Symmetry: C2
Subunit: 75 residues, 2 copies
């Protein structure tokens, strides 16, 4: 069970990155640190390529997720 659980343990975070999250406690759609920002899903994994230099990335909608999934399956 633990070696299944470690398949998604690819996390070497910085010591001081605070994860901002909602009043009920679900993860905020944008996470920012050190002038960088990115989109995360409901779990704490950033979406690949969503990291932007400036700030406030637009988190992808249903169409972009469907396009990425169909392209990857077409691969």
């Amino acid at each position: 069970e633990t070696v299944l659980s470690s398949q998604t343990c690819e996390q070497t975070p910085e010591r001081l990155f605070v994860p901002s999250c909602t009043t009920e406690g679900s993860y905020e759609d944008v996470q920012c640190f050190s002038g960088e920002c990115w989109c995360v899903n409901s779990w704490g994994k950033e979406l690949p390529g969503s990291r932007v230099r400036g700030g406030q990335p637009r988190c992808p909608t249903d169409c972009e997720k469907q396009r990425a999934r169909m392209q990857s399956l077409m691969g």
Copy 2:
């Protein structure tokens, strides 16, 4: 002459990066923008690999420049 001058024109800077510089006007050894910092020489070219995530990079001394030059010439 101009096509010789454009050999070092590899510059697509951001609109709002202000270059901080000395009282007499020589370039400061560290230039910072948007949470990054880097070392530049007397001309306005950043030294490759000197960009750091946190801030305040130690600009290389004589030994590091000599080591890089000797390694590159050994190449």
